[PDB]
Swiss-Prot record:
Role of this protein: Participates in various redox reactions through the reversible oxidation of its active center dithiol to a disulfide and catalyzes dithiol-disulfide exchange reactions.
GO cellular component, one term: cytoplasm
Subunit structure: Monomer. Interacts with bacteriophage T3 DNA polymerase.
Organism: Escherichia coli (strain K12)
Site-annotated residues for Deprotonates C-terminal active site Cys: 26
Protein's name according to its UniProt entry: Thioredoxin 1
Gene3D superfamilies in UniProt: Glutaredoxin
A molecular function (GO) term: DNA polymerase processivity factor activity
Amino acid sequence: SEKIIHLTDDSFDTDVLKADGAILVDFWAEWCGPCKMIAPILDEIADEYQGKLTVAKLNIDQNPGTAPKYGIRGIPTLLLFKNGEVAATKVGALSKGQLKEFLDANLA
């Protein structure tokens, strides 16, 4: 059950900040319907982008510490990290096609 890294506040440094390569971090919560709408889409991307990218999820209620560090203000927010640095930001639900395009464009 791990293609997706399931992050915590304590593991966020190792898992994201010190990863060699691109991580796609999904800031989300259980009550958030758009967050849940995109979850299946993230599963497909995890598979599709395997070897180019890792997908990780931080649940902002269970892990309240990390989101303020990135000025997160609404969910879902997708932050693309490249080797510990944020390259791209996407706020709100989007389709698979839209996510593919956001990824393809920011991964170069």
